[PDB]
Amino acid sequence: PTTTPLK
Ligand SMILES: *[C@H]1O[C@H](CO)[C@H](O)[C@H](O)[C@H]1NC(C)=O
């Protein structure tokens, strides 16, 4: 878990 708000 090392993702971020994809926008
Ligand atoms: C990052 O986003 C991804 C999208 O699938 C997952 O939700 C993941 O759990 C996220 N990581 C954190 C640290 O929130």
Side-chain angles (χ1 to χ4, degrees):
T2 54
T3 28
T4 135
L6 246 173
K7 251 170 59 271

